[PDB]
Amino acid sequence: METWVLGRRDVAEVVAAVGRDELMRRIIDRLTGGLAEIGRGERHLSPLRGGLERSEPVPGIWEWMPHREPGDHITLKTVGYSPANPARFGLPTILGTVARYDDTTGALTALMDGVLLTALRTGAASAVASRLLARPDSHTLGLIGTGAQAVTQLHALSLVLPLQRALVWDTDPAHRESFARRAAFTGVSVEIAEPARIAAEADVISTATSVAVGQGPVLPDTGVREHLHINAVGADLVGKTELPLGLLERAFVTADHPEQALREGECQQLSADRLGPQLAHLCADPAAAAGRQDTLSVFDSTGFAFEDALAMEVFLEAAAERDLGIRVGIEHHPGDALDPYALQ
Amino acid sequence: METWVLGRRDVAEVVAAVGRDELMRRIIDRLTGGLAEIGRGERHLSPLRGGLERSEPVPGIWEWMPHREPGDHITLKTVGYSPANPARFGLPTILGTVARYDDTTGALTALMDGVLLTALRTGAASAVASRLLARPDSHTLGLIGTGAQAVTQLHALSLVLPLQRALVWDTDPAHRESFARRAAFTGVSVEIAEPARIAAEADVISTATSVAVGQGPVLPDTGVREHLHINAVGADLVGKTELPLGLLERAFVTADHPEQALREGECQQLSADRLGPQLAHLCADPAAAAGRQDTLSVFDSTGFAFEDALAMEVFLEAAAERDLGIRVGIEHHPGDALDPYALQ
Ligand SMILES: NC(=O)c1ccc[n+]([C@@H]2O[C@H](COP(=O)([O-])OP(=O)(O)OC[C@H]3O[C@@H](n4cnc5c(N)ncnc54)[C@H](O)[C@@H]3O)[C@@H](O)[C@H]2O)c1
Ligand SMILES: NC(=O)c1ccc[n+]([C@@H]2O[C@H](COP(=O)([O-])OP(=O)(O)OC[C@H]3O[C@@H](n4cnc5c(N)ncnc54)[C@H](O)[C@@H]3O)[C@@H](O)[C@H]2O)c1
Ligand code: PRO
Ligand code: PRO
Ligand code: NA
Ligand code: NA
């Protein structure tokens, strides 16, 4: 028994071989089915994630995210949010890895990058929610925050809605100027637009910013279109929010993970009484979502480990077919199971 | 940047080059100093661990154990307790791995086996406690449970006490009969003896069994020597205990981690106001242990992530000295930190 490790090169090869659209579509499809299974009581929400706050160089958090498929495997994503990483170190803000363990024995069976996988399933989750809650003829996407997540927000949403235009904003001029180049592969025309213009003109919005605790909202509470759907994607520290309270109180709100959203999502701003069914229940019966397409809706996204497990499976399937990755004996399996010193 | 991976081969070469005795002594010494640092308020107990219960093929648990050194790094041990592993799969009951993450960036910097390390630091912790609370001329060790942990319990204790014999019991006849061969290198003569005889004759006892929830005690409530010290090491599911309540109520009880021990240790059986000072406090200020060698004492051991971080440091120091291990690029670090697809 050895651990199957996908290098950064292998993850790159999966993308190049499968194609960006096809890979994202596979993850959207797996996520929509898995969420419906939860909504039907065939699968269960992952446990609350845990985390450790860090104050330097700027406030961030490092988290562990487990999910168990009984009798099959356990998934654990370890992921940091370190918003000074791009400017100070040329590293992504979100940095992580995903491990798979055999549920029967505990053995570490696979390990891979979490950076790309996280961005993919986070875009996919927004596409799942927006397919349910945005107008099917949605033409204009708004993006507040044009960092890493914005790229897969636009990509995934462009696969499920007839987007013709993306109105985008970032507080860092260099980050908003570069977004059109990073988004060019989607074919959707990008325009820089200030938040009040995005609020007024967009059919669907994703907010995905590194805004600090207490420094929201990143979108003003002003004229929004009656049918607006928002994916509230930013999530890290307790006390970080992105949307104005008055907008949230007006909206139909659905969370991906209700207990996580109440602690780390926009639902921090609301009472537990106030929320609708969770995304899994809307996937299982979209009748509850159809009648909210033409009114104000918010998908409160925090990310949960089930999404990472499903995305990892897509990557492992593609990598196995192409004989990608290395095998590394990491765990010590003594020749005598009762002798820790029996190094084989 | 690449992750430093210590393969099972690298861990084997560290212990082969350094030797079991010296490597165990290094971990005993580092654990002693680190515990005293906690007792002096210079460092802090790890947060409570978390886990997922698994019922098949027998009840077990899979846990995550984080410990943060602020500004430096975060350690995470992932470890399963799967008590059917030896008989069913030829695998150790305790199967795990230990990772290190940079606290500033979040990046995965090091990854190694947790099987040997866990056995080493668990023996070491009992040795730290027994130096404080067992008679310094203790001659007879008792072991209830002669599986994997029993090997390093005997080894560690033989380095800090003048042990001449070990009286040992297991409910599996094959496992108690094989213990003498696994223990031979220590030079401590091994004799199989029923638990009542072990209770009557031992100067120090370690209990380290895979007894099921509700099926304790593994040591009977009967006559023991006035000075007996017990390392209660068994720990996994809530409701699993090893010692008889009557014995516990007469003992001076020090826990490695009070909150964890009240949940998962022998202290599950005790009112919280009956606990003695935790082990870290005994290490920083021996006034609390003065005179307790000569009466009944119990070290309630549950294991906590600080111990794994300290033992990992010992391994990484030896591995760095010898340039052992491999570098694997696992995390995707895009050339453009704001572009997850820049598979750069
Ligand atoms: N919900 C999920 O499943 C999930 C998954 C991954 C990341 N996230 C979260 O999404 C957020 C963004 O992550 P990322 O990887 O895109 O980070 P990033 O650092 O790559 O991008 C964040 C961008 O936000 C910009 N920004 C900061 N404050 C702003 C403001 N007030 N208005 C507009 N823009 C602002 C920054 O300039 C930066 O360009 C983080 O909170 C992250 O933790 C959520
Ligand atoms: N305190 C810590 O830090 C720490 C660290 C590692 C493991 N543990 C715990 O120690 C315990 C033993 O772990 P291990 O790795 O030695 O497992 P193991 O499976 O190698 O050995 C356990 C032994 O206990 C025996 N046993 C079961 N019920 C018994 C009973 N009533 N009386 C006597 N023997 C009995 C089994 O036959 C087996 O040989 C587990 O609960 C484990 O989770 C604690
Ligand atoms: O779900 C995730 O992976 C990210 C991590 C930070 C915020 N949510
Ligand atoms: O501290 C530890 O590693 C072990 C794991 C199971 C029981 N406690
Ligand atoms: Na959110
Ligand atoms: Na215990």
End-to-end Cα spacing for chain B: 13
CA–CA separation, B11 and B318 (whole Å): 10
Task: Please tell me if residue A151 touches chain B, with a CB cutoff of 8 Å.
Answer: yes
Report the amino acid identity of residue A184: A
- Report how this structure was experimentally obtained: X-ray
Supply angle C-alpha B214, B85, B5, rounded to 5.
120
Question: Which residues are CB-neighbours of B237 under 8 A, at least 6 positions away?
Answer: B53, B59, B60, B61, B81, B213, B264
A199 φ/ψ angles, rounded to the nearest 5 degrees: -60, -40
Strand partners, B94: B81
CA–CA separation, A251 and B191 (whole Å): 73
Contact A182, B338 (CB under 8 A): yes
Task: Please tell me if residue A119 touches chain B, with a CB cutoff of 8 Å.
Answer: yes
- For tokens 């964890």, what's the residue? B260
Domain B117-300, CATH homologous superfamily name and number: NAD(P)-binding Rossmann-like Domain (3.40.50.720)
Sign of the CA dihedral with A287 first, then A288, A291, and A293 last: negative
Resolution of this entry, Å: 1.8
DSSP, res B336 = S
Strand partners, B50: B64
Q: What is the DSSP string of A29-51?
A: HHHHHHHHHHHTTSS-PPPPPEE
Strand partners, B81: B61, B94
Test the A interface: residue of B1, B331, B344 with most A CBs within 10 Å: B331
Assign A8 to helix, strand or coil. helix
Find the radius of gyration of the CA atoms of chain B: 20
CA–CA separation, A236 and A248 (whole Å): 19
Nearest ligand to residue B265 Cα: 6
| A330 interaction partners in chain B (CB closer than 8 Å) | 5-8, 97, 111-113
Residues, chain A, total?
344
Assign A300 to helix, strand or coil. strand
| B112 token code pair | 């190694």
Rounded to a whole number, what is the distance in Å from the CA of B312 to chain A's nearest CA?
14
CA–CA separation, B252 and B244 (whole Å): 14
CA–CA separation, A274 and A256 (whole Å): 15
Residue of B nearest to A86 (CA): B337
Residue of B nearest to A100 (CA): B78
Question: Which residues are CB-neighbours of B335 under 8 A, at least 6 positions away?
Answer: B342, B344
| A283 token code pair | 């996937």
Question: Which residues are CB-neighbours of B64 under 8 A, at least 6 positions away?
Answer: A50, A64, A66, A76, B49, B50, B51, B76, B77, B78
Strand partners, A30: none
Any idea which residues of A carry the catalytic annotation? 77
Q: What is the DSSP string of A165-181?
A: EEEEE-SSHHHHHHHHH
Contact B146, B168 (CB under 8 A): yes
Q: What is the DSSP string of B141-169?
A: EEEE--SHHHHHHHHHHHHHS---EEEEE
Ligand 2: lining residues by beta carbon, under 6 Å: A 338; B 81, 83, 86, 93-94, 118, 122, 144-150, 169-172, 175, 208-211, 218, 233-236, 301-303
Find the radius of gyration of the CA atoms of chain A: 20
CA–CA separation, A105 and A39 (whole Å): 29
* Candidate from A35, A209, A254, A256 with most ligand 1 atoms within 8 A of CB, to mutate: A209
Contact B342, A15 (CB under 8 A): no
| B197 token code pair | 């005889």
